[PDB]
């Protein structure tokens, strides 16, 4: 049998979007209220409170009403002034990408760039900060998703703080799937969204903003105002007694309310543990069947996405097509520099269950062997299962 | 009895958000696909084709992934450059407000302004264009929702076209609820969204873009690129064979698919008729009970919102609060310079059914008489019902 | 305009089914678990607990897996033995109807029957019980819905208990819309369901069963066993540690879970008060416009349904057709003896909001006047609104 | 990690209930209409027509409003009278169980019984009919779910027809998942439901009834009338111009409408192929890892359920508990005389996709090896995948 391209797949095991939690799908269909209805104003306030609790935040996170690329661009537009000296950290497609936004708001850009399967060495950051005391803003991506690798943002953040500089973090593809919070890395702007590990659809930004960052942006006359890119306009909009700059995405808010309920109710630690175990099992299965994990070492491999290097002579696009057509299972391509060079299996929210690593490994193995490889698929499943049983 | 503020209302009869069509609420909970899944790529293309059909467009409309203020700001940012002289037409809050974005992107701003219960006079527009050959861009709002009034954008669009200028039209709160389309008014940029008459929640923009606007925007060095504010980035994103600039709002696209299906299957003309009839019934009831429609004349009054002038002396905020606490019925306040001046009752998509005019009339009249007025509520119901019964 | 018969109506204002609460519609789409899954076994136990709390019950109510006609037939089949002498009370279509089931299980049937717009006089019941001391079982319908009238079941129940007899109550169309509970009327079997005032779809029975009734049925060798009609087989099925006689309606259970949440959370007293106020307003509007409430006196009129007598020369079926085609509003016909003689407006769960009485009155008036009546429709709305405002 | 019993599982891979198709979960939340609303009357008729098409029926199937045990009991109660001599065929729990209802409605019961891993032998059936001209009714179960085995009902139906007897077929767990229809097996009463392979929840019965069965049931004074157990009451209820004996399960009808659409649109043959392929893959994996399929032979093994014999010595209950606690995967126990003897993995509607066989194999093998077995799990996955890859 074959699954046609026009029809739904059986399992989406991508690095996001994945199908949302079923409770969230239902939550998206909640009553759409007028945004100035007193019941919605109370709801919105409560959703901000739930976000604050989930993000372990000492102050209110800001919800912005676009998918997290809005928070990332807006953070650059608001926190980076033309006299700032920005140090961008790039270990992948998104990290490198952020440097273009920094360059938009300040002409002074320093960068540390490493190969796109490695992580940023905190010591290289320390060295650069010593060499360049004029640095005022540092930007970093936690999980550079097209690579399935993790940067040590907490150790980086402590150094940035040591040098009196501001920190911007992209935690879009990491928050909720591992232990990470604005406080943990001393972030001044920490950008995430519910559309990766939190198992909601794209549409909203969750942004932690330090009191120091508030002061800086508010004093910046170039910080966007009366703009979709404005953070400062949203400063008090959490409050049931205050207006919204423009109409909030009411249905996405209902979905986020549910996503947060699920996370808080399951218990964030339990949620992180199942992501990490699923990815661990996946990596063990990948290695045991005769494939290689992309990341240069296992210690920097993401618990929320496994990237698998494409063997020579293997068309990565035909591989993904074959996994879907044969087995109903969808994986992600790479992006930019990793496009064509690896395949990505997400472990995110509802897909972060070890049984899905088993399903992923089988579909991946199957498609590889269809392409003429001779993978030990059984050995792979057994290695992944040994990982799961060892944790039991 | 009284309805708690924290509790959900009975009927939301605002000028938007209103509750989405029940089908759209379910559509919102459809499977969330990977955006690069072939079934999603095909869906996305066929949603643009549905929008193209609904908008009677000769070319593809652009869907942008923010609620339509994004379209308005992006249209300014991309089309207007400092070489342009902009004529902004302002008969209300949104028309006036567009001039502020116009002024952000060119220092040359001409305006025609009328009080916020009137419409722009096409003869005034013709006279202004003749007197100012230097005008290159004209902006206009079709239904300036906070006043519940309509501008003659088709006659205006034709004058503007003869002049040789670009037309930017805000049709957010009119499209789907009355006869209007980009090529009816020769619009270069026509911004609408499904969050008013089409009965979907806030979060997407549907934009008609003329070939001439494409060329102007793509030439402009100051037009947003690699930005949430970018129209140009999204030009080819309709195609199943092309990437998305950033992750589309998958659930909102699902809701929009359904909303377009509903509109196209019911028949646009039939849909416009029931908005007009609901509104006509509303105005007749308002007048008969002893209130005044805000609009300077009945001929410019919107078929998708009835604004009702607050009697001098009546506290409009307390009135709306009373309509909800007593009757469970929610109305919109005015906005900006109409706030405190009028109450608004939307007739939009699911609420554009004449029986909701009856409910609205009784709650508004009920609240008014509790504020000490002495309205002829029964007379008002009978006049609205005569309009319903007369409908040939 | 006209609403076609094939398409959805705008408002269903029937005596049931009405559209379910929106939370319940969503609840129906909850994950369907295996019925022997430990999570479902816990859920089922919890839903029985919620039912017990809502019904003010000292022991566990039994959930049966068919709409309440199952509970009614099964109560007759299990509680009425061939040597029982049954006194059936009939003030309408359902009360009279129950006598046929009693006659199925015992040849000894006494009846008190009154006209189908009146209620049972508790004194007539007292008189009959004195005249017939051999009576062992008494059956009564609380709200004989096709008549929109209420029997004094608490006063009847105290008398039945005084004479040592068993009481069967049909509270299908009353429980949840007024103060009524198995304990209140001393019922031995009290049959209701969530498909009227509780605002869920048809599919389940909620049955209060006295310890005395348990003893009787269990000792009855004719009580259905290994049967859809069995009550005794379900005795312990509430328990997470016990099997289900056959597969429970898992989705209906999810809907009931939500329906009960809504009722308990709103507060049963507040729920009863809004039903009673909506019906009161309706009756006042009916009388003021020149129509007559069916019930022989206002004191026996149901708070959960208003029945309106059809004027001479008026085709009741054409009337309902006209209300739906003109205004999008659906009413119920009568049944049996009341078919053709009255129209029924339910006030049940989500339709038990006074604004819906206003909508109902207008549609009813409108259709009457289309049929050549000359109703004072305005006066009707004003009288209903005066009722609502008097309660404010 | 471990999955809490109170918490929802990851994958329900039982022999029913399984989670409904996502479309069906949404269908369940469609508008609940008044059952005498013309749009509902029309819906109900068109759902019977869809069922008629799906069942390849020459006449209307009857929908009964209880889960299919209602159909089975009603079929006995209505068709079998004490003049009948019944031959009940029992190869498992449900076949044996039907004889108990047969014996309730006629004292004359003949049986052919085989052990609960075998199928009925048609030659034995032919021999029995020849030896007993007095047989007038024959009962048979197609897929006796607790054994995961199939009877040759088409050959049996033909023998029974030649004899001159009535055939009652239980196809609850086979219809929709393999080639079977009332007129394939000359069924007089063919009972199925959408709660297994059609992927809807429990609560409705779909019954094919021959014209001869109609005449026999309608003649029988002991056939249930004015009863939940009545087939005859529901004869004309398909028609939009006819009443319902009692209130139909409106939401379940909505779910069924969707389930029929899915089945008919996918194409029944394609649907049967994917159940067969999933099951074939499952059996191959079970055998390769070192377990035994319960069925006496592969040829009688069901394409909609694989029963796996518990190794002697293994605690089957603890095993299922372990598969859920370790892997989040839920299997069915056996029932009655198969309880403790085997574990069941359903391949039904949404779970009939070969990738779920892979997940099931890994969880079952995983649980077994935790119970001390030494299965070749990888071998098992590779054998199941060879079957998937071989599928021409």
Curated annotation (Swiss-Prot), chains A, B, C, D:
SUPFAM superfamilies: PLP-dependent transferases. One of its GO terms (molecular function) is L-serine-pyruvate transaminase activity. Homotetramer. Catalyzes a reversible transamination reaction between pyridoxamine and pyruvate to form pyridoxal and L-alanine. This is Pyridoxamine--pyruvate transaminase. The modification N6-(pyridoxal phosphate)lysine is found at residue 196. Its cofactor is pyridoxal 5'-phosphate.
């Amino acid at each position: 049998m074959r699954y046609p391209e026009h029809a739904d797949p059986v399992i989406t095991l991508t690095a996001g979007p994945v199908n949302a939690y079923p409770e969230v799908l239902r939550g998206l269909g909640r009553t759409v209220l007028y945004d100035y209805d007193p019941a919605f104003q109370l709801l919105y306030e409560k959703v901000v409170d739930k976000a604050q609790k989930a993000m372990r935040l000492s102050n209110k996170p800001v919800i912005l009403h676009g998918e997290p690329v809005l928070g990332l661009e807006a953070a650059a537009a608001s926190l980076i002034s033309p006299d700032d000296v920005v140090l961008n950290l790039a270990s992948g497609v998104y990290g490198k990408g952020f440097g273009y936004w920094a360059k938009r708001y300040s002409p002074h850009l320093l960068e540390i760039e490493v190969p796109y399967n490695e992580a940023i060495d905190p010591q290289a950051v320390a060295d650069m900060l010593k060499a360049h005391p004029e640095i005022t803003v540092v930007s970093v991506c936690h999980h550079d998703t097209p690579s399935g690798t993790i940067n040590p943002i907490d150790a980086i953040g402590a150094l940035v703080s040591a040098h009196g500089a501001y920190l911007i973090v992209d935690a879009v593809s990491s928050f909720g799937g591992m232990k990470t919070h604005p406080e943990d890395c001393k972030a001044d702007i920490y950008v995430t969204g519910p559309n990766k590990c939190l198992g909601a659809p794209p549409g909203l930004t969750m942004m932690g903003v330090s009191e120091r960052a508030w002061a800086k942006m508010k004093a910046n006359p170039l910080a966007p105002r009366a703009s979709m890119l404005s953070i400062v306009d949203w400063e008090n909009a959490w409050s049931r007694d205050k207006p919204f700059p423009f109409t909030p995405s009411v249905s996405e808010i209902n979905g986020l309310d549910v996503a947060l309920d699920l996370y808080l109710n399951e218990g964030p630690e339990a949620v992180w543990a199942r992501h990490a175990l699923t990815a661990k099992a996946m990596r063990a299965g990948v290695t045991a069947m005769g494939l290689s994990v992309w990341a240069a070492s296992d210690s920097i491999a993401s618990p929320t996405t496994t990237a698998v290097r494409t063997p020579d002579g293997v068309d990565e696009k035909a591989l993904r097509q074959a996994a879907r057509a044969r087995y109903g299972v969808v994986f992600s391509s790479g992006r930019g520099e990793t496009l064509g060079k690896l395949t990505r299996i997400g472990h995110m929210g509802p897909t972060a269950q070890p049984i899905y690593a088993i399903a992923a490994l089988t579909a991946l193995g199957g498609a590889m062997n269809a392409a003429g490889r001779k993978l030990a698929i059984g050995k792979g499943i057994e290695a992944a299962l040994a990982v799961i049983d060892a944790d039991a």
